[model samples]
Target: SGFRKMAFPSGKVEGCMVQVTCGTTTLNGLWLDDVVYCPRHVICTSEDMLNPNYEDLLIRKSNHNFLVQAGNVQLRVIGHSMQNCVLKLKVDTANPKTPKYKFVRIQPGQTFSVLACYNGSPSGVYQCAMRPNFTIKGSFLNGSCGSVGFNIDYDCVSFCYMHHMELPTGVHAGTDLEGNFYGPFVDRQTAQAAGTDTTITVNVLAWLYAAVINGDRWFLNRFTTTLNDFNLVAMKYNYEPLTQDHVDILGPLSAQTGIAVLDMCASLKELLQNGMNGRTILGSALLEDEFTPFDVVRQCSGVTFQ
Candidate 1:
C-alpha cells in the first residue's frame, strides 16, 4: 500500500525481495529502482526544451554537482553523481593526494561529512579528489581546477579542556562491581562523605587489578605505598590489612598472568563470597592497607608471566 522513495544514481539497479501484505494474504516480490518514469499523457514540445523554465521540478533532478562546506574541522559533501564518489580530507595542503589520509564514499544527493568518515585535523586547509571520468562543478583550490575544498580553524586543546571540565563527577558513565559511581571528581568526593564502602572497595580493586594485569611494577610499588598510608588511618575503624587469604586468592590468578580484566574481576567476586573474613580482607586492603599482600608477592616473587 505504501512505497519508499528510492533512488540509485548508478546505471545498474540492485534487486532484493520484499514482503507485501494485503488482508490475511502475503506475497513476496522483487524490487529495484534505477529507472525513471514519466506519465505517458504528458507531451513535450520543441519550444519547451528551447525556452525551459528553470523552476520546473522535473528539470532539477537531472542537475548533478557538489555542494561543500567546512566548519568545526569537518567537511560536509553534498554529492550528486551516477557512480560512487571517493573523497579524502588532507591535513597537509601541500600533499593533498597523499594516501596517508583515508577516503570516504559519498552517494548521490546524500550529504556526507568527510570528518565524520575520516577525522584528520582540527585546523588546516583541506581539498578533495574525485575519480577520473567523474567531473563535477565546484569551487576547489590547491592549484587544482574546479574541485571542492574548505578550511577549518579548530583549537584542539581548548575544545578538550571544555568537555573535560563539563563531565559529571559521580558515576561518569557505567557502574562498578558494588554499583557505586566513580570519577569526574565530584562523585568520588560524594561517595566518600556518604560512607559508600563498597564503592571505594570496587574502585580500589579495579585500580590494583589493572596494575597487576598490566605488570606495571613501578605503578604497583607506588600504589602499595599509597595503600599502606591509607591503612594507618583505617586502623582506628578496626580494619586490618591484606592477609594470607587475599594472597592465596590471588595465586590462582597469578598462574595466568595478563588474564582478561572481566575474568580477573570475576575471580575477585567469587573470592569475596568465600567467607566474611575474605570480604573483610578485601575491604581492609582497599580501605586500610595501601599495600595489599598480593602486591607484595607480585613484586618480590618476580613472576614474569604477566
Candidate 2:
C-alpha cells in the first residue's frame, strides 16, 4: 500500500468494522479509523418501530466538571433516530455558573464533535484553572428512536500543562539602579506557580505598550501572540480586547510608574492574597526599569533583536 507514516503519534489506532448482533443476525458497516458513524443509520435493522431501552442509551444522564492541566479533550455528540432529534449543550469557561448554550437538531446519520485547546501550537487546556463543565440533554424525543448521546475524553497531560502554563521565566531581570543582578526577575518556580495578575501584571502594562508603539512586525507580532495566550491569566477569560484607551493609558501609566514590585514577584501576590480581578487596571513602566528607550528587542536574547 502506498502510505506514508500513517501511524498515530501516541499509538497504533487499529481499524475495525462496525457491526451489531441481535438474535441470530449481525449487520456490518464499512469503516476505518473513523468509528464516528452513528449505527442506527448505518445498520438497516428491521424496526419500523424502535426499542426505547436500547435507544435511550445515547442520551447523557448528567453534567461534567473538571480542571485541565496539560492536555486536550474530545467531545462528541451523536443523534440516531427515525424521528426528529433535538439536543442542547452548554459550555462556559468565562465564568462559573454562567451558561453558553448551543442547540442542535440532528438527523439519523448525523454526528458532531468539539475538540478545543488553549493556543494550540503549544495546545494546552481548553479553559485555564477550572470552570470546565458540560451538560447535554435531549430536547424533544424522550430518548426514543435510536440514540442521542455524547461522550467526553481527556487526559491532563503530565507537565507541559494548560493555561499557557508553559510559564517561561520572566525574561528581563531587574536591577535596582546599578544593573548589578542583570538577569530575569521572575524566577523559574514563581513563574510557574504564579498567575499573571501579581507577577506578570508588574510588567504586563509597559511590556505591551513598548511592543505596540515600537511596532516591529516581526517581534511585536511574536510578543502579541505570547500576550494573547496569557491574557487568559490577565483577563481570566473575560478580559477585554485591546483598545485605544488601553494603549494610551497602558503606555503612559507604565511610563510614570516603575514596574518593579521589589520582592522579585512575591510580595505582590501576598498583598493581593486578598483581591484584584480582571477588571483591575494599570499603567506603564516600559522605558523605566526594564527596557530603557523601548527598544526591548534585547529580550529575545539578542538573537532576533541583535
Candidate 3:
C-alpha cells in the first residue's frame, strides 16, 4: 500500500472502490469498518414464517372502544360511526394558531387517515374537533357533533408517550413535549408496560433506515462502473449492480438500487405490522451525534432523509 503509514479516518470514502497501488500491486479496498455498505434485501424463509399462525392468534380490542394510531410525525382519524355521514376533522396544535381541516365521507363502517403537518412537526400540543353531518332520508340536519383533544409531550430519554382517552363525540389524544416520538406517558406504566420500549425500538430503527439509504446512494454512484467492469456481485444473494436488464428480470422498476434498499428498511416494520394497518408513521430525524460520521457522508448525497 502506497499510503499504508498515512492513516485514513475510519469513515466512508467518496468513491465506490478506491485503489491503493504499491508498485502495481494492491490489496482489498478499505471500507468504513463500523458501517455495513451493501444493504441486503433480507427475505424470510418459508419455514421461518410458519411459526406465527394468524388464525390461532387471539385478538384483543382496546377496552376504551377508542383507537389512536400515532405517526412518526402525524396523526390519523378513523371513522367509527354507526351511520353514513360526511365527517369534517379540524386539527389545532399549540404552535399553529390557525386550524387545518380534513374532510372525508364514510359509510356506516369505515376508516380514513388525515395528514396534518402541525407547525411543520407533530411534536406539540393537539386537539381535534369532529363534525358528522346527519341526514334522515332527504332531511339534512346540520349540528355540531362536539370535540375532543389531548396534549403530546416528548422527553428525549426514557420519557415520551401519548395519553389518549375516550370522549363524547370522538377520541381525544395528547402528549407531553419532551422526547423523541418514543415514550414515557404519564399512565403508560400501568396502561402498557412494553409501550415505551417498543416505541423506542421503532424510532431508532427508522432513523437507522433513513441514514443507510442516504449512504448507499454515494456507494452506488461510485461503483456502478466497477461492478459492470468485472461483473462483480454488488448486492446480496449474488445479485448484480444497477441495470435495466436486472430490473426486467426482477420486476417493474427504474431507479437507483439505493431506493429499493430504503424501501426494504421500511418493510421490516411493514411486514410485522401487516401492511401499514394501524401502524405508526415514521419520521426522519437525523441523530447527528449518535451517527455523526455517517451523517456527514449523508449530506454529500443531496437527498432529503425524511
Candidate 4:
C-alpha cells in the first residue's frame, strides 16, 4: 500500500540503465550509470545517471540538481523499501510540495527503465516541462523464477511539454482579404523565432509557455505554476509586474488570442485570435481588445494609432 519495490532500469552496462518512462510507454535512449553515452538518444545531466533505488525511485535528478538540459523532464518519486525490493511509489507529478501516492509493487527480477519526463542533450542542466498519462506493464520469463510481471503504474501521471516557440522576423502572420493588407506587423526585435536572440526559452520547467512580444517578456505560466494549474486556466498570460493574486485568478480576454471564456474579460488570447480573422469580429464573440485591424482602418486609414 505504501512502500513497495519499484525498479527503474535499462540496458546492460554492468549495474543497470534507466531511461525516462510514462506509465507503459518508455522514451528512446539507454542510460547507464550517471552518464548516458547512448549514441543519438539518452538521458543525461551535468554528471552521471545514478542507480535509482527500487524502493526510493526519484523523479527529479538530485545529484545533478533541478537544473538540467532543455529536455530534462522530472517527477520526484519518494519512497522507502527493504531488501525484498518492496516499495509503494509516491510521485510529485506537478509540484514538489504536493505528491500523489500509488499502490504499485514490484516482483523479484522485474525492473523497467526510468520514466521519461524530458528529452534532449545527453548532458548539462536544463528545465523540462511535462505531464504524463500512460502506464508500463509487461512480464518477462525470469528463468526458474517463472514469469515476473514488471507492471508499474500508479493510476495515472502526466507528460512533459515544451513551452513557447519561434517564428521568422520582419514578417507577420495573418490573413489577407481582397486588396486590403488586413495586417502587417513590423516588430523590430519582438518576433516569433529565428530572430537574433529573440526567442523564448521554455527550458525552464516552471512555465508552460514563453515568448517575447513588442520587446516585452510574456509567457503562459511561471516557475510557481504546474502542468495541472495550466490545465485549469490554459490561457493565462504571464508577464513581469504581475501579482500572485492574479495567479489563481483568470482575467478577461477574447477568444482568438490565447484562450477566451464566455464570462471572463477579454485578454491576449482573444486579441491574438482576432488578428487572424483580419476583419476583427469572428463568429458571435465580440473581441473587447482593440486589434490591429481596427487600428489600421481607424476609419481614418491615413492616420496611425499606437
Candidate 5:
C-alpha cells in the first residue's frame, strides 16, 4: 500500500493536503489536533481573524481541557520501508506525562492507520513532533518534522443542537409572547448548493406510527429534546451586534427586553409541510405570526383563569 512516502516533524497534525488512503477506501477517523480549531461556535474577535489569544480557557462544567472539537482521521501509508522505523506522537508538550506512542515499521503496500488526537482545551497553537528527531521538513518532510501552527473555524452554531449553545447568533431579535427576546435563526450557516441532497424526507410519520405501536416515545423525546436544546430557553442569549448572538431591541425597550423563541417554528409548520425544500423560509413572519399567536391573544384579551 506504499500509497504515500513523506516525512514531517511529528507530534500532531491538522490534516494536510496529502491524501492517506487504503486502496479504494480512504481512511477515516476523528482527530484532536492542538492548534486547529473548528470554526463552528467559536466567538470571533478581531484578534482571532488575525491572531489568537494564547492563554488557555476552560470549557464550563467539563474537566476536558480543549481548544477545538477533536478532528479524527483514518490515514494509511503504503510501504514497508518505514517498517521498524520509529515515529513518536505526543499530545501535550506542557505536560510530558501525557499520552505518546511510537509507530514501528509499516508493511509495504499495507495501509497503516494513524489516529491523530488533538487537544480540545480551546483555541491556541499546539506543538506536534515526529520521532527520530524528524521535526522540520517543511509542512511535510523527506523524513522527520516538528512545528506548531494555527487554523480557525468561525461558523456559527447551527439549529437543533445537542448541548446548550453558550452563544446564540442574535441575527434578528424581537419580543415573543413570553416577553422574551426571540433571536430568530434564519437558517444554518452551512447550506447545500443546488442539485445537492439538502433535506431528508424520510417517513417521519411512519417512524411515529412505529413508535406508537411499540409504545415507545423515544422519537418524540428525541425530537422534543433536540428542539429544546436549540430553543431560546436553553441557548445562551447574545445581545451584541456584528456577532452571531446579536439580540435586537425594539421600541423604547429596557435592558431586560432581549428576545425569546417567537412563533418561528409554528409559523413555518403552518405554512408548509415542513418546508418542502423549495424556498428559503422567512424569519420574522415565522416568529411573529405562528409561535406568538396563542399567548398573544390570551394576554391581549386579558383572559383570567379563575
Candidate 6:
C-alpha cells in the first residue's frame, strides 16, 4: 500500500491478549511500565466483590526493597502484571517494618495504582502476592539501595542526550575569538564531568531568571499559535496551537541553553563582532562574564517585564 510512505501509522508498538485459567477470577490491565512496578492502577479477578492483587506471576517474592529518589524519576519492577499496570503505591511510604498500609483496591475493569511521593531516599524492595485475595505486600532493602548502573540526574544540566540519548548526536561546538570552531561542548555529561561549571552555573541561573521574568515563555508565545495557552518544559502552560515551524525555531529552553552555553564561552570577541541582538542576554557577554547595557529587546524578553 502507498500508505507505507504516507506516515499514518509509522510508529512502533506491540499487541497481545491475556489468558488465565483457574479460581473464579478475571483479567485486568496493568498500566505500569517496567520503569516502576508503578502503574497507575491494578486489576483484580474473582468475587462480584473485588480483591485486587498487584502480585501476579511477575512480582518477585525475594526482591525485598524498592528504590526511589526525590524529583521526577522512575524505578523498575520485574513482572508480567507490571507490564502495563502500576504498583498502587500501597502505603504513604513503602516501609514494611510498619503495617500501616491498607490492602490494594480494584475497579470493576481496571487495576489500581498509587501515586506516591516518597520524600526521602526510597528503600530497595517491594512485594506482591497471587493467592486468596489479590494483595500486594511492599518490601525494601533496609539500606541496599544503589543503582545497578547509570546515574542520570534529572536536573543534571541540559544535554542533547536528553532529547535522544540513543545515537548521541547533535552537539553544539564552541567557537574561538577568531571565529574558529573549537571543541564541541556536546555531551553535556562530559562537560559536566570536566570543569565547565562556570558556564553551566550561569546558564542555569539565566534560565531561572528568564522563567522568573517569563521572558522565555513570552518569546515562545510570540511565535506560537493562539490556540496554545502556555507551555512548560514537560507540560504545556497552555494548549499547543502553534505550527510545527515555531516549535522547530523555539528550540526547547533546555536545549537552547545547552547550545547557548557552547556559544558563549567559546569566544568573547566573536559574539562582540556579530552585534548580539538575537542572542544577547541582559548586560551582554557572549559568556556571562559581565553585564551590558539593557536593551529594549532584552527587557522585552520577559512576559512580565512589559
Judge candidate 6 at residue 290 and give its lDDT. Answer: 15
Q: What digit string (tens of lDDT, one per residue) describes model 2 on residues 1-306?
A: 111111112111111112222233222211112222212222223352143232353332332311111113332322222221111222222212112222232211111221121111111111111101111111211111111121111221111110111123321111111111112222122332223322224233344334433431121211122334444444542333333443444444334433321211222222234343332222322212222222222222222300
lDDT of 5 at 266: 26
Q: Which 10 residues in a row give candidate 5 its minimum summed lDDT?
A: 157-166
Q: Candidate 3, residues 1-306: lDDT per residue as tens digits? A: 010011112111211112211122221111111111110000112342344232222122121222111222222222211111111111122212112211222221111111112211221222121111211111111111111111111211111111222222332222212211112222121232221101112222223344444442211222122224322322321222334332232221213233342243233333333433332322322211122212222333433311
Number of the top candidate by lDDT? 1
The TM-score-based order of candidates, best leading, equals 6, 3, 1, 4, 5, 2
The TM-score between candidate 4 and the true structure equals 0.18
Superposing all C-alpha atoms, what RMSD in Å does each candidate have to the true structure? 24.1, 22.4, 25.6, 23.2, 24.7, 22.0
Worst ten in a row by lDDT for model 4: 140-149
Candidate 3, residue 182: how far the Cα is off, in Å: 15
Better of 2 and 5 by TM-score: 5
Better candidate by TM-score, 3 or 5 = 3
How far residue 214's Cα lies from its native spot in candidate 4, in Å, is 8.5
Worst 10 residues of 1 by lDDT: 156-165
Clashes of each: 4, 14, 20, 61, 68, 43
**Local distance difference test, per candidate?**
0.24, 0.23, 0.21, 0.22, 0.20, 0.22
lDDT of 5 by residue, 1-306 (tens): 111122222233323212212112222111222211122112223343243321221122121222212234322211111101111111231222222322132211111112222232212222211111111111221111111222111221111100101122211111111112223221123321211111111111222222233343221221121234333322222211111121121111112222121222222233233432343212112211111122222222344411
Model 1 per-residue lDDT tens digits across residues 92-123 = 11222111111123211111111111111121
TM-score, one value per model: 0.18, 0.15, 0.18, 0.18, 0.16, 0.19
Write candidate 6's Cα lDDT for 133-187 as tens digits.
1111122221111111011112121100001011123222211111121222221
Regions of model 4 farther than 4 Å from truth: 1-122, 132-246, 249-265, 275-306
Error of 1 at 38 (Å): 29
